[PDB]
Amino acid sequence: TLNPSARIMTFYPTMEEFRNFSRYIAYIESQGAHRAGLAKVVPPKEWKPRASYDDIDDLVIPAPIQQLVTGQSGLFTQYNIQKKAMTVREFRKIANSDKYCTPRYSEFEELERKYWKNLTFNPPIYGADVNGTLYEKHVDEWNIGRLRTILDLVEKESGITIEGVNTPYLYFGMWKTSFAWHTEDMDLYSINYLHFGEPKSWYSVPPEHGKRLERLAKGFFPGSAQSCEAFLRHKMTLISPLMLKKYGIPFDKVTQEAGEFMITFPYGYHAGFNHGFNCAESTNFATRRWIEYGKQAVLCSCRKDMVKISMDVFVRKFQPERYKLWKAGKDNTVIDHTLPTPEAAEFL
Amino acid sequence: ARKSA
Numbered sequence: 001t002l003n004p005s006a007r008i009m010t011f012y013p014t015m016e017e018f019r020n021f022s023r024y025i026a027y028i029e030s031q032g033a034h035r036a037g038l039a040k041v042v043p044p045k046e047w048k049p050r051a052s053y054d055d056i057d058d059l060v061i062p063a064p065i066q067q068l069v070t071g072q073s074g075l076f077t078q079y080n081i082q083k084k085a086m087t088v089r090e091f092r093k094i095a096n097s098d099k100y101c102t103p104r105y106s107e108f109e110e111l112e113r114k115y116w117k118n119l120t121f122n123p124p125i126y127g128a129d130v131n132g133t134l135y136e137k138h139v140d141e142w143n144i145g146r147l148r149t150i151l152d153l154v155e156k157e158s159g160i161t162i163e164g165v166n167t168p169y170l171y172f173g174m175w176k177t178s179f180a181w182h183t184e185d186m187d188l189y190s191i192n193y194l195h196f197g198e199p200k201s202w203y204s205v206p207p208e209h210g211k212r213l214e215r216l217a218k219g220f221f222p223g224s225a226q227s228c229e230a231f232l233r234h235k236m237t238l239i240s241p242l243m244l245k246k247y248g249i250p251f252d253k254v255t256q257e258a259g260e261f262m263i264t265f266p267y268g269y270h271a272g273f274n275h276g277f278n279c280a281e282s283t284n285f286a287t288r289r290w291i292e293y294g295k296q297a298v299l300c301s302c303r304k305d306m307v308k309i310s311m312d313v314f315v316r317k318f319q320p321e322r323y324k325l326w327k328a329g330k331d332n333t334v335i336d337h338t339l340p341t342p343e344a345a346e347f348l
Numbered sequence: 349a350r351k352s353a
């Protein structure tokens with residue numbers, strides 16, 4: 001019906017559509033965008049999150065990670081080793097230097113090839129997980145610091161703050177820096193804006209096929225699966241498109257350019273890599289449709305202090321008629337990944 | 349608790 005091919009969709013809102021975030025997410029879901037697990041949203045040309053990016057050179061990256069990768073035949077494991085702090089200024093110099101810079105290429109496929117050929121050599125440094133926002137306090141549209149979604153009920157009612165989830169994160173990339181296959185904490189949505197710099201390429205598995213990817217990864221890494229059910233949440237596992245194709249996992253790819261938003265959808269598996277020096281800002285968010293995902297999310301057991309959000313406030317507020325049953329462990333609801341969020345009543 | 353890469 002709506003995106004029967006489940007391919008990644010791109011959207012081009014007017015400033016008027018840009019004004020209401022939750023509504024536009026509802027709209028693109030009514031168009032089937034969520035079926036791919038990932039979507040691109042290009043803001044109108046007039047919109048800018050900030051006027052200029054040169055006043056940021058003194059911003060500190062407290063905990064850079066060197067990404068060491070081991071593996072073969074399209075299956076890899078990534079070990080992130082923490083490094084001493086540096087500024088953006090210092091990071092740019094290392095990123096744009098001849099050792100870590102993007103190699104020469106004609107078309108994207110070549111660069112993609114070089115990424116999967118070279119990802120275990122010359123480990124790069126990733127400026128990840130930096131608390132902060134590059135938005136300007138007066139930008140009211142699609143502000144990653146305040147999106148006004150129902151996820152706020154974690155802070156506003158329960159008083160809990162979870163860094164990177166209900167607060168913004170910055171990511172300073174260089175060539176070959178990557179993010180492994182994962183869904184979001186509590187299978188939330190995420191939003192990602194590339195502020196400036198070289199592109200970020202993404203891979204995505206449709207939520208309706210997510211279980212097939214999990215079985216695949218379990219088969220490849222049984223030791224890891226025995227130790228933790230949700231081990232993919234460790235964000236250590238890299239699997240090439242050739243392997244996905246070989247084993248019959250549906251997926252799509254898309255490249256994100258400076259000034260573009262990417263939205264990931266509940267239980268969308270995604271992975272990717274940065275083309276060169278860049279800066280991205282990201283956070284999680286939610287809609288009504290997410291509540292059932294949150295209730296059913298399989299979480300990491302093996303590590304201390306992992307992100308676990310109490311679903312109680314959500315069930316209580318948006319599903320009062322199911323609350324008693326849910327508290328009793330008797331809620332048998334099955335998720336249909338193809339369905340849009342209820343907020344799209346008007347659009348359909 | 350925080351988000352980790």
Ligand SMILES: O=C(O)CNC(=O)C(=O)O
Nearest residue numbers: 171179190191192264282
């Ligand atoms: O930008 C990165 O390195 C990783 N980002 C995400 O996984 C996301 O935005 O959901």
Ligand code: NI
Nearest residue numbers: 183184190264
């Ligand atoms: Ni993600």
Ligand SMILES: [Zn+2]
Nearest residue numbers: 228300301302
């Ligand atoms: Zn675990």
